Amino acid sequence: AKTRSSRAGLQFPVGRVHRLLRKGNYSERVGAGAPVYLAAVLEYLTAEILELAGNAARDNKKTRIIPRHLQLAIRNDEELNKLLGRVTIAQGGVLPNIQAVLLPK
Amino acid sequence: RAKAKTRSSRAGLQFPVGRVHRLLRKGNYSERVGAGAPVYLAAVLEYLTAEILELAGNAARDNKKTRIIPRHLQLAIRNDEELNKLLGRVTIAQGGVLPNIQAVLLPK
Amino acid sequence: DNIQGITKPAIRRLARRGGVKRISGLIYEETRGVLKVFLENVIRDAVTYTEHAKRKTVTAMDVVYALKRQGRTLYGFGG
Amino acid sequence: KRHRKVLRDNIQGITKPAIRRLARRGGVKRISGLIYEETRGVLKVFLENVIRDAVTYTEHAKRKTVTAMDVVYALKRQGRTLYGFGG
Amino acid sequence: KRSRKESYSIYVYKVLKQVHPDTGISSKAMGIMNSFVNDIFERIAGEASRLAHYNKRSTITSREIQTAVRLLLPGELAKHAVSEGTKAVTKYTSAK
Amino acid sequence: KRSRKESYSIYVYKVLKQVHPDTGISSKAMGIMNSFVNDIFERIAGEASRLAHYNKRSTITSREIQTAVRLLLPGELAKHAVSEGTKAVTKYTSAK
Amino acid sequence: PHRYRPGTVALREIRRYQKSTELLIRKLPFQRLVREIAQDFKTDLRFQSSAVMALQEACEAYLVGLFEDTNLCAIHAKRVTIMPKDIQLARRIRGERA
Amino acid sequence: PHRYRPGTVALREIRRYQKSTELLIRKLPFQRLVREIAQDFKTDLRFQSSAVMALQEACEAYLVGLFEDTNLCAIHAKRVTIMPKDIQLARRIRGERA
């Protein structure tokens, strides 16, 4: 009952990836390692965002993740923000922030 | 046999259509490349080459020089609105910058 | 000209989200000009995709693909 | 090899007079004192980032020598395309 | 009938139920997630594609993927992304 | 004997002599003309590659090279770039 | 006769719209402006709703972050009121305009 | 004896350098700063001179430009004197820092 993915310990589809790699004008030939590794990176990152947004959604008392939660998850995280720098999240909103100079007293 | 006529010569071009064709096929752009593509491209590359060399060449004369140099290019490009858009993240080695001193930094 | 349809108060709300506290009245025209240029530059590209697919309907992807050429990359419309 | 291969603290080799000139090219007239040590940082950070990737391309091709082209690739990764050293 | 348009949204669901079993996800949120997979897949793939081309190689391997991942993620993410990527190919080569 | 390194330089010269007969060019400047051709190839070639792949095609044609050119070049440059490409395709086609 | 002083509502509006994610431009107008602009490229075009909504998501983003950088340009010049010269600088540094 | 009012040489130096292209940082120091920084990433690294030349070309160019945006950010705040806060603004806007 082993699946290429399950040999590699991944939810992410190693087979799918290894096709998308051949079919995507990346290179002539694609190593059998590549699509494990690649899939494995995508899973890690996907998992990191979900754990963070999961908590955003619990913290704001929800069973379901929404764009905001993902935006919070990413924007409130030094590194993910940097990775998704030039990337607009539809329906995400912006981080509450008012420049101090503008406040009273 | 028929005697070899280059694809460049059949298209009225100077830039190698042949080379281009090969570079396309090779560069992981697509599985198949039309016979059109490398002509059309080789043209656009000849065009853009000719536009810059027309202007740079002018900027060489402007400095009383027989030879175009990095600076002559940078001048030609930066003073041409479109080219400058097209090379707005390109750093020209040894090309320096346009004479420009801000108004309020001039005297009285 | 629907460019005016972009009301002063819609420009105010936007500015409020951007942390802005006090707005020059000159800005609402200034903003509009910019928003038009941004659209032009996006929609021009989008509808070049439209026309290249021999379509008469602009899709999300057309837009998304344009926003990417413009380094304005967009998540959640089919990326 | 191991012999006589350890560097000093070379960021100070970015002399005030040299920073001043760069700012001149940039059309700048009057220059706060604090500028020069700020610039040194900025420059540092620049080179760090550009170099790291440059070297990553070096390591990947399994060279012990950084190339023209490593720098060039790295600069292009960082959106700072450079003409007239190949590519 | 319709199209038969692929996504990743089952794999997102699997990973979600792993890190937050009792939490779920709105459809936009999902489409956001899906966009994000495709983005970074393309980001890494390109760099890998290039790495090879630069080094006259025909074949994008797990090596190119790692070089590219080092170059594209920031250090701390990158440390872990390599860790997992390494770990998985190790665990796939020791499998069958 | 050194193994060969290809360059657009001779085609840069032929175009140079077409445009400013009595003007020549410094090595370093030719180095900039090469980086420039090479840059704009990679752009046009890339955008076409993307264009086909977006439209589920295996073949980049002169039609992709064109749509790409319209996207990458700005106004009056791209016009000339098309017409000049148009001419050059139509010449080849009629001169078989 | 109760009257919030100048700047104490504006402050509330800031807090409000930052918290929220809904689009701040009224939808029908925006959509007219889209077809208007599109006209000048190609006539009798049709837009998937979501192409228009994709487009609005991005205008709104584009703008809100420009207003972010505008506000700084205000403050860097010892001001609180954003002005055309503050947007102009924000775009000139960003590299949008020349 | 002959003395030029403050700025009269600044302006002259500006005109001097804009007109030239020659690299303004002293080459050997730059070379040393490269290898010193490359050590943080990998030891016993050799450099093609052309690499260090690309790395210098690229640095000055970068900085020359950062100064342009800094010089605007000074002027924008009614100054003529660039200050560190001017650089930091330009970079925040350019999205180099957050």
Give which of B102, F1, E24 is closest to D23, Cα–Cα: B102
The count of C-alpha atoms lying within 13 angstroms of the C-alpha of E8, restricted to the half-sphere facing its C-beta, is 30
CB contact under 8 Å between D84 and F28, yes or no, is: yes
**Chain H residues touching residue B94 (CB < 8 angstroms):** 21, 57
Assigned domain for B1 exists: no
CB contact under 8 Å between D83 and F31, yes or no, is: yes
Region at D44 (left for phi over 0; alpha for psi -120 to 50; beta for the rest): alpha
Two structure tokens written together for G40:
């000048």
Instruction: Count the helices and strands in chain C (H runs, E runs).
Output: 3, 3
- Secondary structure in 3-state letters for G6-62: CCHHHHHHHHHHHHCCCCCCCHHHHHHHHHHHHHCCCCCCEECHHHHHHHHHHHHHH
Q: Which residues pair with F85 in a beta bridge?
A: none
H near C: at least 3 beta-carbon pairs less than 8 Å apart: no
- How close, in Å, is residue B4 to chain D by CA atoms? 31
Assigned domain for B44 exists: yes
Assigned domain for B75 exists: yes
Interface B-H, measured as beta-carbon pairs within 8 A, has a size of 41
Inter-residue contact F72 to F44 (CB < 8 Å): yes
Nearest CA in chain G to C20: G71
Q: From CA F15, how far away is CA B49, in angstroms rounded?
A: 8
Assigned domain for B59 exists: yes
Q: Is H54 exposed, middle or buried (0-12, 13-18, 19+ CB in 10 A)?
A: buried
- How close, in Å, is residue B29 to chain A by CA atoms? 6
One-letter identity of residue E77: L
Q: Is B3 exposed, middle or buried (0-12, 13-18, 19+ CB in 10 A)?
A: exposed
Residue H55 has its nearest CB partner, among D13, D38, D47, at: D47
Range of the domain at A43: 4-102
User: What CATH code is carried by the domain that includes residue A76?
Assistant: 1.10.20.10
Interface G-H, measured as beta-carbon pairs within 8 A, has a size of 35
One-letter identity of residue B48: L
Method used for this model?
A: X-ray
Domain count, chain B: 1
CA torsion sign for G66, G67, G72, G77 is positive
Q: From CA B45, how far away is CA H28, in angstroms rounded?
A: 38
SS3 call for H46? strand
To what resolution in angstroms was this structure determined?
Answer: 3.5
